[PDB]
Amino acid sequence: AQSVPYGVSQIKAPALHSQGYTGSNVKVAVIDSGIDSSHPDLKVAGGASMVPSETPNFQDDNSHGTHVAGTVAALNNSIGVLGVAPSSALYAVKVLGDAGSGQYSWIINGIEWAIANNMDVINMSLGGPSGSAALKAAVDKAVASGVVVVAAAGNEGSTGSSSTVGYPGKYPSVIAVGAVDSSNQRASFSSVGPELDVMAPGVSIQSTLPGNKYGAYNGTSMASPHVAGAAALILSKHPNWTNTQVRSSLQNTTTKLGDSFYYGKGLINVQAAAQ
Secondary structure, three states: OOOOOHHHHOOOOOOHHHHOOOOOOOEEEEEEOOOOOOOOOOOEEEEOOOOOOOOOOOOOOOOHHHHHHHHHOOOOOOOOOOOOOOOOEEEEEEOOOOOOOOOHHHHHHHHHHOOOOOOOEEEEOOOEOOOOOHHHHHHHHHHOOOOEEEEOOOOOOOOOOOOOOOEOOOOOOOEEOOEEOOOOOOOOOOOOOOOOOOEEEOOOEEEEEOOOEEEEEOOOOOOHHHHHHHHHHHOOOOOOOOHHHHHHHHHHOOOOOOOOOOOOOOEOOOOOOOO
């Protein structure tokens, strides 16, 4: 094998993978239904569950997250696919029960673990319809102490004027992405709103699942793991650049697609706004 998912390939990731930049030094928060330890092409630094039902959380039943985290950084060797930062330290958080949802108390909690546990990169695959001040305190504080968070959203599409963006979404802090294919065109089931801040792939991306193999997800939660990939990896050449900085880094330097409402600002480009 050796195959790589074009997933990134589109953002100029495979690139930096050469110089030596393999997202090393950074820990990434992949808060989701879980990630597999089992998997031959996975390496987990740790984790801790926050909701009492599936309470290792190194067994994932669902694949939302084992898969997400997949695009995050999947072992590089003769095993298949790869991401942005294949050799970052995966932190696996489960705030959901999997094959269902869970409560902001589970969303808010593991995402203060990964921030008050010195996690550099945070990947939040989920979107909520409304959010509180409680969700606004940890997103504001996880962003005020070094962390840079990215969250999903897209699965509600258009509404004319009213925007369809999840929480963490409509707030300033945080950078919510969306899904693109390769045509460099939007996606039907992809969220729009004054908030969209940048855009990545997210459609029929191969990766790894429970059991021992991969499979195909299409959605907007698989896009978020693109950012927070380059994210780890933009902290590669400057283990010492802030949140703020790298914020403008990806955002500062993308490719034009459409209006600041389904398009954001463009696509991910590693070796451009990440230098």
